[PDB]
Structures are given as C-alpha cells and as structure tokens.
Amino acid sequence: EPFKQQKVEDFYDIGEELGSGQFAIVKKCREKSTGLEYAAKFIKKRQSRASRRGVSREEIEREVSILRQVLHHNVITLHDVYENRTDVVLILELVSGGELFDFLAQKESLSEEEATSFIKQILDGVNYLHTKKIAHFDLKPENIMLLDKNIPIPHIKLIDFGLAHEIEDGVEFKNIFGTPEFVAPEIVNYEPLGLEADMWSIGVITYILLSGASPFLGDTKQETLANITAVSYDFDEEFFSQTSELAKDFIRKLLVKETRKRLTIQEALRHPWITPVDNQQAMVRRESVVNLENFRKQYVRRR
C-alpha cells in the first residue's frame, strides 16, 4: 500500500480552520521545509462497523485514487497524503478566493458573453475528468471555487472529490447521492449512473447562474424531488426576460429525462452558446445579460 508512516505535525505547521464539513475538518497548514501555503483536510477514519463518526477505509482510498489521477489546472491538485490511525489528512492545493457565485454577486453588470467565460472554465476541468472516466457527482456552486479574487477574470478550481467515482464499462453503479437541487433524475430513482449525471448538474448551475432561481426547487424536499422526476422547469418571463434563445437551448438540452439524449461534455463545448460559429450567433450572445437583480437577491439568502 502506497502510504506514508510519518507524523504530519513534524512536517507541516497547522493553522487556521478554513472550513469544516461534517465527517472531516479542513485546516490551512504550511510546510516546514519550503514555507509554502497549503491546505490540510483531516478526514476522520471510521471505527469498526455501524459507527456514526468516520468515513470508510475503502471509501477514503477511493477519493485518493481519483486525486492522484487528477493533474489539471481547472481542478484542484493533491499535494501529499498522510495517515496515522485517528485521521487520514490530505494535503491539498490551498484555495482562498471564495465561491464563483460569490465573485459573480459582486459584479454590477456582467454580460452573457462574460458569463460564458466562466462556464467554459468549469466545462474544461469537467472534460478532463470525463476523459479519465471519472465522475464528480457533487457539482454545486459551493464546489466551484476560485483561486484569487483580485484578478479581472479569475481562475476556477473544482473541489471536494469525496463524491467522485471511477466508472467502469460493464460494471453498474447505483446509489442515492448528494444535494436536493443539483441531482439527476437517474440519481433520484435507484437507477444506473454514469458521467451523464454530471451534465445535468451543469445545466442546473447554468440556470441559476443566469437567473438566480433554481429550476426544480419548490417548497418542500418532497416537491423538489417530484419536480426532478417529473422534469418540470419553467422559463419565467420575470427572470428570463432578457436572456438569449441560445442560452435557453443550451440548458434545455442538458436537462433531459433520458441519458442517451442528454448532452455529453464534448457536445456541451461544441454547442453554439459556448463556442459559436459566426457573428450572427455571437452578436446575440454579446447583447444579452444575466439578471443580477434576482441573482443577488436569491444568492443572499444562502448565508
């Protein structure tokens, strides 16, 4: 087994707790030898059987097997892996530039062309994963992070690969998964899963990015889930008054009931709204905007 048997305190000086999840606590560390700013995700190891605290010994080396395979600019990169007994701490690439949606909340104008700049960033990291047959099933606005906040056009990093899985060809993989809003209908029913699931999320992220209101959330969880299986999403004129017919079409072709008819990542990149062919399309994309009034009002309530 490729793991290190050194005390993590002897090599890295631990500091600020950046943000704790539920079964793991993430703390901003620093290397003793190089003085380089790094992150350190202390993941609590599980006891023996039906323990309430801790993640699996099998499922922890799965999240690692993904991150070792992931070398790309638009996703996060794993620096080092330490373990002792209590915890398995992962030294990751430190990211301190807030959510993407946090940076977009700041913007006072932001066009639909300017918006596509970022969407493309996401798609890039996503395509790298799909190429390696990896599926990041947790794709929410809180997972879409930024390296630095100061830059005119900032870098996007994708984080938290706990809910990532290497997909085989013949081997089926069913499971009940993460967040009420951003989940495919194939996930809601106990149905086989693939890379197709990720693409659904993208469409939901885009929908909210352009308007602020979610396409499937109702009032109760019960409703939200029935909406996703029923595939009910309305482009209300209150939110989408000044949004393009190519933006609506990009989202419309991502949020499909089936899996065959749902767009692949290559198809998302080769879509007009993302990569146009002529000026006739590029003019509409330029002269369209994102409804920041609603986007600010909706995103404010998530804090």
Side-chain angles (χ1 to χ4, degrees), residues 103-122:
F103 180 82
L104 304 177
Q106 216 84 324
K107 285 279 184 176
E108 59 266 303
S109 54
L110 194 116
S111 65
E112 198 167 290
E113 203 188 69
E114 277 198 55
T116 311
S117 177
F118 303 106
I119 306 292
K120 220 275 176 173
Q121 290 197 68
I122 288 106

Side-chain angles (χ1 to χ4, degrees), residues 146-161:
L146 261 48
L147 211 151
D148 201 61
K149 198 172 187 175
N150 302 315
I151 310 159
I153 292 171
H155 202 106
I156 283 164
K157 285 283 191 172
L158 299 176
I159 57 132
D160 199 301
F161 280 82

Side-chain angles (χ1 to χ4, degrees), residues 179-186 188 200 216-217 223-232 257:
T179 308
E181 279 168 291
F182 323 98
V183 279
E186 64 213 51
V188 179
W200 175 272
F216 297 102
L217 183 138
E223 283 178 33
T224 300
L225 285 155
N227 284 8
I228 293 173
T229 310
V231 197
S232 303
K257 187 168 172 61

Side-chain angles (χ1 to χ4, degrees), residues 200-228:
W200 175 272
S201 308
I202 309 302
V204 187
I205 305 293
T206 310
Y207 192 101
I208 298 159
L209 204 144
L210 289 180
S211 55
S214 185
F216 297 102
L217 183 138
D219 290 303
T220 62
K221 183 186 192 170
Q222 210 257 135
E223 283 178 33
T224 300
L225 285 155
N227 284 8
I228 293 173

